[PDB]
């Protein structure tokens, strides 16, 4: 139910990341046996799947996405798309 639209969440907002923050993350290389990696076969940010050659990461508030797309996502929004967790990890 979607009667009131708050479509601006926090009072503050959260900051990006930073490359060296992102690329210091595991890199995790999307195998052929790998379909899903630790959650649904679709990358959300791609809203394509997971096939062999492409680079995948994880957060750590234990999420993966692709490296490349959420190097971008993580210095334009700064936040986990699914948990909405800051990165970096807040305290
Ligand atoms: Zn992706
Ligand atoms: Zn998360």
Same mark, same amino acid.
């Given at each position: 139910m979607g009667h009131h639209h708050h479509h601006h969440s926090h009072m503050v907002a959260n900051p990006p990341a930073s490359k060296e923050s992102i690329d210091a993350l595991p890199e995790i290389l /999307? +195998?052929?046996?790998? !379909?899903? /990696? !630790?959650?649904? @076969?679709?990358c959300p940010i791609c809203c394509s799947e997971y096939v062999k050659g492409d680079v995948a990461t994880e957060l750590p508030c234990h999420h993966y996405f692709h490296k490349p797309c959420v190097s971008i996502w993580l210095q334009k929004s !700064? +936040?986990?798309? /699914?948990?909405?967790? @800051?990165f970096p990890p807040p305290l």
């Open positions: /999307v +195998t052929e046996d790998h !379909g899903a /990696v !630790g959650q649904e @076969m679709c !700064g +936040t986990c798309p /699914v948990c909405r967790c @800051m």
